[PDB]
Write a protein that binds this DNA or RNA. Structure first.
Ligand SMILES: NC[C@@H]1O[C@H](O[C@H]2[C@@H](O)[C@H](O[C@@H]3[C@@H](O)[C@H](N)C[C@H](N)[C@H]3O[C@H]3O[C@H](CO)[C@@H](O)[C@H](O)[C@H]3N)O[C@@H]2CO)[C@H](N)[C@@H](O)[C@@H]1O
Ligand SMILES: NC[C@@H]1O[C@H](O[C@H]2[C@@H](O)[C@H](O[C@@H]3[C@@H](O)[C@H](N)C[C@H](N)[C@H]3O[C@H]3O[C@H](CO)[C@@H](O)[C@H](O)[C@H]3N)O[C@@H]2CO)[C@H](N)[C@@H](O)[C@@H]1O
Ligand SMILES: [Mg+2]
Ligand SMILES: [Mg+2]
Ligand SMILES: [Mg+2]
Ligand SMILES: [Mg+2]
Ligand SMILES: [Mg+2]
Ligand SMILES: [Mg+2]
Ligand SMILES: [Mg+2]
Ligand SMILES: [Mg+2]
Ligand SMILES: [Mg+2]
Ligand SMILES: [Mg+2]
Ligand SMILES: [Mg+2]
Ligand SMILES: [Mg+2]
Ligand SMILES: [Mg+2]
Ligand SMILES: [Mg+2]
Ligand SMILES: [Mg+2]
Ligand SMILES: [Mg+2]
Ligand SMILES: [Mg+2]
Ligand SMILES: [Mg+2]
Ligand SMILES: [Mg+2]
Ligand SMILES: [Mg+2]
Ligand SMILES: [Mg+2]
Ligand SMILES: [Mg+2]
Ligand SMILES: [Mg+2]
Ligand SMILES: [Mg+2]
Ligand SMILES: [Mg+2]
Ligand SMILES: [Mg+2]
Ligand SMILES: [Mg+2]
Ligand SMILES: [Mg+2]
Ligand SMILES: [Mg+2]
Ligand SMILES: [Mg+2]
Ligand SMILES: [Mg+2]
Ligand SMILES: [Mg+2]
Ligand SMILES: [Mg+2]
Ligand SMILES: [Mg+2]
Ligand SMILES: [Mg+2]
Ligand SMILES: [Mg+2]
Ligand SMILES: [Mg+2]
Ligand SMILES: [Mg+2]
Ligand SMILES: [Mg+2]
Ligand SMILES: [Mg+2]
Ligand SMILES: [Mg+2]
Ligand SMILES: [Mg+2]
Ligand SMILES: [Mg+2]
Ligand SMILES: [Mg+2]
Ligand SMILES: [Mg+2]
Ligand SMILES: [Mg+2]
Ligand SMILES: [Mg+2]
Ligand SMILES: [Mg+2]
Lengths: 144, 260, 67, 185, 62
RNA sequence: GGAUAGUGGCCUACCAUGGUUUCAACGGGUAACGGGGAAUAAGGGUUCGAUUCCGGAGAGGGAGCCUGAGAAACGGCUACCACAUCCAAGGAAGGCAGCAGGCGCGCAAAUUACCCAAUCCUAAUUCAGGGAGGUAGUGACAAUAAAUAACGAUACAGGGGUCUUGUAAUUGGAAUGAGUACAAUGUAAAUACCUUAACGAGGAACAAUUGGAGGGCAAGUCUGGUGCCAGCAGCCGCGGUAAUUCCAGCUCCAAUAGCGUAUAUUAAAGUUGUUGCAGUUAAAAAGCUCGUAGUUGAACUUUGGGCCCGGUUAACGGGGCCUUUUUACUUUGAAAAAAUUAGAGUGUUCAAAGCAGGCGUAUUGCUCGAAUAUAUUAGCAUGGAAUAAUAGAAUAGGACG
């Protein structure tokens, strides 16, 4: 029983068979395949600067109804086009076409969050100030 | 890496210098000596860090360049000069002398010997061979080569050595129950006598030891230095006389003489 | 307070063994005048470019009429 | 390539942050000691845990073990010397029972209140951090100063300030000088 | 999902709510002195009971 | 044989056909310099290490070389390729992964400062030189310490005549550094720290913040705004007219000179399972049998008896007698860098640290320190002979004198 070798000489059959089944673990897979460095819009980094293409309102999922006010962004280091959500209230007015905004994840391990389908990123800064200091009125966005 | 390395980094220095972590990135890097800079005392360490006579780097030179210090009978100009085991270090204007001998923790101890006993030194004969013309020769731990020696002397003896001249005043052979100072190792700095020498063909003979308090322990033959006849060294050992008192035993003796 | 002090066996022996930055604030010596390290450094780099007295050189300058 | 100057963090923060009860017990300890932030409660429970864990793996060693001898008795002797472990509770078993209020009790703040000199823990601190509670000759303004057992009797007001010695404060010495032109010329 | 909706109303609720000023009020103690007031109001005082030890009720029921 | 400083297919000549591999060669990837170490803190582990120390490699890419004890050197030369500077058009010069500093890159990182005083190195050498190094600027990386108030008075509520807290914004004198600054102190010279004249406290200033208040999860059935809109919401969910959830006011919780967010990683995770998973039906026993590798494989060979010597709190431990007398493993040790981890000691005012210090007669002084233990693989020496392997006389080519 136990289905696995306990023999005193069996170290390699053990050491291997685990190294084999570790591949079933999602977190381990991603590390070996280099998933982030390849398949991710960010390089595997925590943030990306990009530039806004078009302001995008997005319908929500069930059972919710509202327009979510996102943007299309083209990452500078990358060129990969990505859609990011603009949070709080009426901050879409703070970003415009071709505004050069800084992005971050949603904290979801790459998944999309909440009633917003297919948006994995959020705006952090605009023009290099912040979403707070604008929405909280503390600072103000400069001119181009 | 392209040649000789002219620097030493602090934290890379020998531990038995007892340098402090901060105060610089570098140690003195002892000069090319009679002794291996691994196990050796640069003059600056002795004068400045032990005798506390010199406060500076520039100050140690002002002493030597004032012609003050000698070592093993001869004046030593070199700041980093590597005074090793069984050395002399006479300072006339201070009237003192010091024979370098190890602690029971294993560091070079600051040990004053009188205007005599700084006459002679002991050294361990590392090899004895035939030189040119047939002339036999012998050389000590510190690289003294002495010519036309006693046919009894073999490797792993010691030799009593006059300084102002040289040569050989008697000697001590290596056999059961001789006095021995431990040159380096886990047991470095200890003193004892020979319980047995475990022979090993092709390197690393074990030497069994017993001290004045009847403790047993072993080290390498290469680190076994004969210091004389059992219970009677040929030089003056410091306090504890290399007895290796246990850490527990230490605490008492510190809180013993500590009171009123 | 805590500090250090030295009692010398001559004044001429403190005229010798003593670090010279004290000898100014002690009055026994004079603060030396030198341009800042780089200005001191640069002039040395300028001069090694000339191999000689530098005398025949600056004349050959005026041999061809200045620079 | 400077020698690598070392350091450490003095506290360990709790796993489950929001526990409804523990929050209260800490708040009390903040008041019934007179502590600034919850970190000064954390600092001690971390100290205690390493103290405990030290004794934890020490009692695992069958007795007459030099490690249980030399080290275990080097703890007690330090632990009593500050007044935490009572003059004799001394054992490796009685440090494991030693709780968090015992260290906190020995703080210079929680002493300066204890015998005279303060009559508040908030007056205590304010006194400590401002100059004069000094122990012996040296002023020590640290509210955490950790009074040792026999250092106790040497703690009184400091050789300076209105409480222990020369001159009064310049709050009042300014009051006496503003009647100098009022009641004088 | 369906990616083109109205952008017309954004900052709507926020900008149609009336501004309310924050009252000028006594500055609260900092440091240990704030942690002093918390000691009392939770116990040594016993503002509220029924075993709830209510920290912040709407001004009770009656 | 030649070549080297020298061994060696290092190269050449002749000769043979060898050498490695499922115990994983060879090949590919590495967002790979190796190590000391770091994060995590039942145990067993998982993850990381460009980076203070050691070793290695390189100086745009390659190769070649001169000098030399030492270089296949680059702040040396020669060539090529790729850059790139001056030019009078003939020519000439260059290598910041040294210190600064510029452009570029991006989420991502500081002054074209001072100095040889310290640590040290170099030289013909106490003197000179050192962007090694040190100082200072920038510096919320990280770590330590831990101000933002303290005590009465009076006026009402309240606990056995009267304390002792709760509340007034009605007063009362107290205190202190944050600043500010003679000085001296520090220092190479300043800078700041420490010590200190004169100055420095009434709420408005010497005004703490960041997140959150349905559950998880600690704190609003309060008011106003909005009306499945604007928005919140890690997840469950909130909002479609009386919103515990959005925007705010009020209050309240939480941690607090710091709190939040993104990303990675660890714990939780016995959801990688050696410890320690699960597999009839939730994910999952090959259709069936053979079988190489691999892993695994019954028992039996000195058992028992009798005395002795010296050990440590009759239980037990160690060393010898008598009775017909090759490994794997396990202990002890040696040889193990310093940092780092653990840890002894010590009043840096506490502490993080540091490895100093401590007593004195303080008028030519005494003096204890700088302990201790650690990755358990390999190697070396050693005691142990259970366990599991291995050899031994079968056509005797056996042992013995
Ligand atoms: N500015 C830093 C660097 O300077 C370099 O330029 C320098 C080099 O081209 C050349 O430097 C030579 C060097 O080639 C040679 N192999 C060594 C020599 N010592 C250097 O010489 C230099 O230093 C001496 C003082 O020693 C000074 O007279 C002068 O600054 C210069 N001739 O002289 C230039 C300075 O005058 C390059 N432009 C570049 O790598 C970088 O800009
Ligand atoms: N720091 C001093 C010591 O250095 C040691 O360094 C190691 C190596 O330097 C040394 O390696 C060997 C040595 O085994 C042997 N008996 C002598 C030999 N010359 C050394 O090797 C030397 O030459 C080789 C080949 O050129 C180089 O690759 C190597 O870097 C160099 N050290 O052996 C040491 C132990 O393996 C250790 N790090 C340590 O004991 C200690 O730190
Ligand atoms: Mg859903
Ligand atoms: Mg999309
Ligand atoms: Mg900008
Ligand atoms: Mg931006
Ligand atoms: Mg940015
Ligand atoms: Mg040197
Ligand atoms: Mg070596
Ligand atoms: Mg040959
Ligand atoms: Mg050869
Ligand atoms: Mg072939
Ligand atoms: Mg690489
Ligand atoms: Mg790595
Ligand atoms: Mg590395
Ligand atoms: Mg851990
Ligand atoms: Mg663990
Ligand atoms: Mg676990
Ligand atoms: Mg890299
Ligand atoms: Mg890396
Ligand atoms: Mg290196
Ligand atoms: Mg380059
Ligand atoms: Mg020559
Ligand atoms: Mg090189
Ligand atoms: Mg070079
Ligand atoms: Mg080169
Ligand atoms: Mg260069
Ligand atoms: Mg021309
Ligand atoms: Mg640079
Ligand atoms: Mg940029
Ligand atoms: Mg940064
Ligand atoms: Mg960084
Ligand atoms: Mg210097
Ligand atoms: Mg100099
Ligand atoms: Mg001269
Ligand atoms: Mg920071
Ligand atoms: Mg303030
Ligand atoms: Mg100050
Ligand atoms: Mg909120
Ligand atoms: Mg709750
Ligand atoms: Mg409402
Ligand atoms: Mg909520
Ligand atoms: Mg609200
Ligand atoms: Mg696990
Ligand atoms: Mg096991
Ligand atoms: Mg499972
Ligand atoms: Mg199934
Ligand atoms: Mg199949
Ligand atoms: Mg430590
Ligand atoms: Mg068996």
């Amino acid at each position: 029983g136990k289905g696995k070798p306990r023999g005193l000489n069996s170290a390699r059959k053990l050491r291997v068979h685990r190294r084999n089944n570790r591949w079933a673990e999602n977190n381990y897979k991603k590390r070996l395949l280099g998933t982030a460095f390849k398949s991710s819009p960010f390089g595997g980094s925590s943030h990306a600067k990009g530039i806004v293409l078009e302001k995008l309102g997005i319908e929500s999922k069930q059972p919710n109804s509202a327009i979510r006010k996102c943007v299309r962004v083209q990452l500078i280091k990358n060129g990969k086009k990505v859609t990011a959500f603009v949070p709080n209230d009426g901050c879409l007015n703070f970003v415009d076409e071709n505004d050069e905004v800084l992005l971050a994840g949603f904290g979801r391990k790459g998944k999309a969050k909440g009633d917003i389908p297919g948006v994995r990123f959020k705006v952090v800064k605009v023009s290099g100030v912040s979403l707070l200091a604008l929405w909280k009125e503390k600072k103000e966005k400069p001119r181009s | 890496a392209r040649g000789p390395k002219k620097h030493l980094k602090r934290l890379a220095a020998p531990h038995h210098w007892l340098l402090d972590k901060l105060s610089g990135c570098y140690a003195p890097r002892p000069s090319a000596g009679p002794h291996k800079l691994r196990e050796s005392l640069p003059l600056i360490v002795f004068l400045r860090n032990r005798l506390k006579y010199a406060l500076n780097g520039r100050e140690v030179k002002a002493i030597l360049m004032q012609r003050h210090v000698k070592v093993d009978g001869k004046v030593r100009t070199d700041t980093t000069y590597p005074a090793g085991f069984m050395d002399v270090i006479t300072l006339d204007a201070t009237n003192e002398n010091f024979r370098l001998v190890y602690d029971v923790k294993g560091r070079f101890a600051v040990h004053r010997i009188t205007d005599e006993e700084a006459s002679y030194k002991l050294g361990k004969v590392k090899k004895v061979q035939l030189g040119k013309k047939g002339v036999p020769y012998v050389v000590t731990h510190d690289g003294r080569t002495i010519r036309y020696p006693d046919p009894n002397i073999k490797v792993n003896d010691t030799v009593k050595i006059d300084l102002a001249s040289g040569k050989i005043t008697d000697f001590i052979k290596f056999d059961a129950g001789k006095l021995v100072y431990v040159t380096g190792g886990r047991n470095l700095g200890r003193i004892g006598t020979i319980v047995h020498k475990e022979r090993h063909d092709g390197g690393f003979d074990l030497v069994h030891i017993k001290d004045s308090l009847d403790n047993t322990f072993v080290t390498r033959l290469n680190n076994v230095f004969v210091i004389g006849e059992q219970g009677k060294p040929y030089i003056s050992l410091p306090k504890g006389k290399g007895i290796k008192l246990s850490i527990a035993e230490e605490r008492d003796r510190r809180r013993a003489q500590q009171g009123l | 307070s805590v500090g250090f002090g030295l009692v010398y066996n001559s004044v001429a022996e403190a005229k010798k063994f003593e670090p010279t930055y004290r000898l100014v604030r002690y009055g026994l010596a004079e603060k030396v005048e030198k341009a800042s390290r780089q200005q001191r450094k640069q002039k040395k780099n300028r001069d090694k470019k000339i191999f000689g007295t530098g005398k025949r050189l600056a004349k050959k300058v005026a041999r061809r009429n200045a620079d | 390539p400077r020698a690598p100057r070392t350091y450490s963090k003095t506290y360990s923060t709790p796993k489950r942050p929001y526990e409804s009860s523990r929050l209260d017990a800490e708040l009390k300890l903040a008041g019934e000691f007179g502590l600034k932030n919850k970190k000064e409660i954390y600092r001690i429970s971390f100290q205690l845990s390493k103290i405990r864990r030290a004794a934890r793996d020490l009692l695992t060693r069958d007795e007459k073990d030099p490690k249980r001898l030399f080290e275990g008795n080097a703890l007690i002797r330090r632990l009593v010397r500050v007044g935490v472990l009572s003059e004799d509770k001394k054992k490796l078993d009685y440090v494991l029972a030693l709780k968090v209020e015992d260290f906190l009790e020995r703080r210079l703040q929680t002493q300066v209140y204890k015998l005279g000199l303060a009559k508040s823990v908030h007056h205590a601190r304010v006194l400590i951090t401002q100059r004069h509670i000094a122990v012996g000759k040296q002023i020590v303004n640290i509210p955490s100063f950790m009074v040792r057992l026999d250092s106790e009797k040497h703690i009184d007001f400091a050789p300076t300030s209105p409480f222990g010695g020369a001159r009064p404060g310049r709050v009042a010495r300014r009051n006496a000088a503003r009647k100098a032109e009022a009641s004088g010329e | 999902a369906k990616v083109h909706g109205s952008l017309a109303r954004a900052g709507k609720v926020k900008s149609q709510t009336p501004k309310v000023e924050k009252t000028e009020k006594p500055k609260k103690p900092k440091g240990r002195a704030y942690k002093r007031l918390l000691y009392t109001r939770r116990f040594v005082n016993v503002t509220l009971v029924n075993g709830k030890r209510r920290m912040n009720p709407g001004p009770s029921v009656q």
